[PDB]
Design a protein around this ligand. Structure first.
Ligand SMILES: [Cl-]
Lengths: 216, 213
């Protein structure tokens, strides 16, 4: 029944402040420790700091100067506030519990939240432009989902009907904006006797785009 | 503070093999060490604590050992579900510190990439920019290289590549490489080629198209 859940603005501008909340259930903050851990690409896991059962706190050496972790025991909430955010602060943030001496697992972090993605960028929310990738017994086609922000977008082919043989690549950044390619491989037959469409969804901009791939 | 050095940073092993990951603390941590497993796209989970105690539900094929500054995690009879990144962490003093992690992937038979090249769409050129795309799908091992050539001459700049995580079903990888250039640049040349170098061949796999065709 132990559960931790992170929440908060998943998009923050540089130099600005990150404010996240960890809501726990199934245990009390009065006799448990809660830590904040972040995972940024290329930097494995990084312990940020934590707030202990009595309210005491300890922090990562590098982040101490701009990080403050607090809690509200009555609401079962732990808070993270970090200043002077920069690009490298983009990462998935997790809160995790350790029980201390009252637990068989001592100070190891035995329960983790699902994590919350944080992107630190000056870019503005932008819907993608979708371009076709047409060949110019099997055929590979695709669509280029270019210039959107922030992540993520989801791509399906013929509304999931072509689930087999789809490859959607990790997005890459260029001038603050993301671009991703998604490909689908289908029998030479379908390509000639049936329409193939890539359905792109971008939640953040409340947009859905359908691009039919037609022969060149 | 205490530094945690984990090796190897990455590892590929066959199903059924024995994997061994090391973690060295920069100072004696008196067994106050935990190991965490982070399966793909999931949160980290506690695997082992107090050096060798398995957390609830962790299978017996996992074991931890060590003392002083040297610790290790062992997985015997590696199973597909064990593909993940593993991290050690000490809790001897504050601040707590994590090792850099070890990324464990599955070995499988070599597979050559299926390569496809795509010219920019008429629609995108209207914008004044062009993206030429080369796909390299379902290959193994992951190591691969792409070289773009325009009218027979190599183009190094303006290229971005992206590779998928190992496929949970066929254990292969797929990669896309995109060469971006201005419309003027694109329209001033005719032959576009992507050359792919991979262990599976001794000369590059070449795919090309002519703008004028
Ligand atoms: Cl750390």
């Amino acid at each position: 029944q132990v559960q931790l859940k992170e929440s908060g603005p998943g998009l923050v501008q540089p130099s600005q402040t990150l404010s996240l909340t960890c809501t726990v259930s199934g245990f009390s903050l009065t006799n448990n420790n809660v830590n904040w851990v972040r995972q940024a690409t290329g930097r494995g896991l990084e312990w940020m700091g934590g707030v202990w059962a009595g309210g005491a706190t300890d922090y990562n050496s590098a982040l101490k100067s701009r990080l403050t972790i607090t809690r509200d025991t009555s609401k079962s909430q732990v808070f993270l506030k970090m200043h002077s955010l920069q690009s490298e602060d983009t990462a998935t943030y997790y809160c995790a519990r350790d029980g201390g001496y009252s637990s068989s697992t001592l100070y190891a972090m035995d329960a983790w939240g699902q994590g919350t993605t944080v992107t630190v960028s000056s870019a503005s929310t932008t819907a993608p432009s979708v371009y076709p990738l047409a060949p110019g017994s099997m055929v590979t086609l695709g669509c280029l989902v270019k210039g959107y922000f922030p992540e993520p977008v989801t791509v399906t082919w013929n509304s999931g009907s072509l689930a087999s043989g789809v490859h959607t690549f990790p997005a890459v950044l260029q001038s603050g904006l993301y671009t991703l390619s998604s490909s689908v491989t289908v029998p030479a037959s379908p390509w000639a006797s049936e329409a193939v469409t890539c359905n792109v969804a971008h939640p953040a901009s409340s947009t859905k785009v359908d691009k039919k791939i037609v022969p060149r | 503070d205490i530094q945690m050095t984990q090796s190897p940073a990455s590892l590929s092993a066959s199903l059924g093999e024995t994997v061994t990951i090391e973690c060295r603390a920069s100072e004696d941590i008196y067994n106050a060490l935990a190991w965490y497993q982070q399966k793909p796209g999931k949160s980290p989970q506690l695997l082992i604590y107090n050096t060798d105690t398995l957390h609830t539900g962790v299978p017996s094929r996992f074991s931890g050992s060590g003392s002083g500054t040297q610790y290790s995690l062992k997985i015997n009879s590696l199973q597909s579900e064990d593909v993940a990144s593993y991290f050690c962490q000490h809790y001897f003093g504050y601040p707590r510190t994590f090792g850099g992690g070890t990324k464990l992937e599955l070995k499988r038979a070599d597979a050559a990439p299926t390569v496809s090249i795509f010219p920019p769409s008429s629609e995108q050129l209207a914008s004044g920019g062009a993206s030429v795309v080369c796909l390299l799908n379902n290959f193994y091992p992951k190591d691969i290289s792409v070289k773009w050539k325009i009218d027979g001459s190599e183009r190094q700049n303006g290229v971005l590549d992206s590779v998928t995580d190992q496929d949970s079903k066929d254990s292969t990888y797929s990669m896309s490489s995109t060469l971006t250039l201005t419309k003027a640049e694109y329209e001033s040349h005719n032959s576009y080629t992507c050359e792919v170098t991979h262990k599976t061949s001794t000369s590059p796999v070449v795919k090309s198209f002519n703008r004028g065709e």
